[PDB]
Amino acid sequence: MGSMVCDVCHHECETAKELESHRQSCINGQCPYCMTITEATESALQAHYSICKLTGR
């Protein structure tokens, strides 16, 4: 855990401000910007964020 890490997927975000929107989409299994949906688990969300950077772009 850290000041730049999500409360659900335990992955990073482009900014500490978008990080608050990141967790609110992760709890529902969704990406905060490309709107893609998967399982609401860290294993599935990490697999998505490993290929997605629209999260703060």
Report the alpha-carbon distance of residue 40 to residue 17 in Å, rounded: 21
Using rule CB under 5 A, residue 52 touches Zn ion: yes
- Cα–Cα dist 2/11, whole Å: 10
Taking the least distance from each CB to Zn ion, the nearer of 36 and 41 is 36
Give me the numbers of helices (H) and strands (E) for the chain, helices first please.
2, 0
User: Which positions from 1 to 40 touch Zn ion by CB under 5 A, shown as an x/- string?
Assistant: -----x--x------------x---x----x--x-x----
Query: Interface with Zn ion by CB under 5 A: which residues?
Result: 6, 9, 22, 26, 31, 34, 36, 52
